Amino acid sequence: PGIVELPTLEDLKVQEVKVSSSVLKAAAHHYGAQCDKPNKEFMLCRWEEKDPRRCLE
Amino acid sequence: IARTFYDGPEKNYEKTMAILQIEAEKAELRLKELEVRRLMRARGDGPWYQYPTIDKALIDHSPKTTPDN
Numbered sequence: 001p002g003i004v005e006l007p008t009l010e011d012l013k014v015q016e017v018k019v020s021s022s023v024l025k026a027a028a029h030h031y032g033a034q035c036d037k038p039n040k041e042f043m044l045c046r047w048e049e050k051d052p053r054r055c056l057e
Numbered sequence: 058i059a060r061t062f063y064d065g066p067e068k069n070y071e072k073t074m075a076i077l078q079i080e081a082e083k084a085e086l087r088l089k090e091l092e093v094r095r096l097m098r099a100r101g102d103g104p105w106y107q108y109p110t111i112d113k114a115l116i117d118h119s120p121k122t123t124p125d126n
């Protein structure tokens with residue numbers, strides 16, 4: 001019953017954050033304090049859309 | 058004897074006419090009820106033969122701790 005539309009590999013190319021979990025945990029509080037707006041926008045998009053293919057940007 | 062114990066024939070005539078009318082309506086109603094019961098059991102769109110389903114008020118429309126659902 002139809003096909004599943006998946007994004008291409010080049011649509012999933014992004015600069016990755018390659019620090020370990022301890023580094024993230026050390027700066028978790030300041031990360032939440034400073035980068036709150038894009039994180040909240042992405043989380044809102046993820047919840048309303050309910051689809052990983054609609055919140056890639 | 059006729060004056061004291063019995064009545065005229067028109068009385069019995071009209072009485073049995075009324076009885077016949079009543080019985081005919083009852084027979085027609087019985088047949089119609091059978092047909093209606095058959096149809097509404099086959100289709101299920103009538104008031105009778107309604108079987109319960111799951112109430113939609115039990116669903117929780119809130120964030121579920123995961124984005125997808």
Ligand SMILES: CCCCCCCCCCCCCCCCC[C@@H](O)O[C@H](CO[C@H](O)CCCCCCCCCCCCCCC)COP(=O)(O)OCC[N+](C)(C)C
Pocket residue numbers: 060061062063064
């Ligand atoms: C004239 C002399 C020579 C000829 C004799 C002829 C003999 C005839 C007498 C024998 C009577 C036969 C018994 C049949 C009784 C029928 C009962 C019923 O059909 O009558 C009802 C009413 O009953 C009657 O009033 C008669 C009831 C009397 C019962 C007879 C019993 C007598 C036996 C004697 C017993 C003696 C006892 C002694 C104790 C020691 C009628 O119902 P109703 O819907 O309202 O009236 C419709 C007609 N209207 C509307 C025009 C008025």
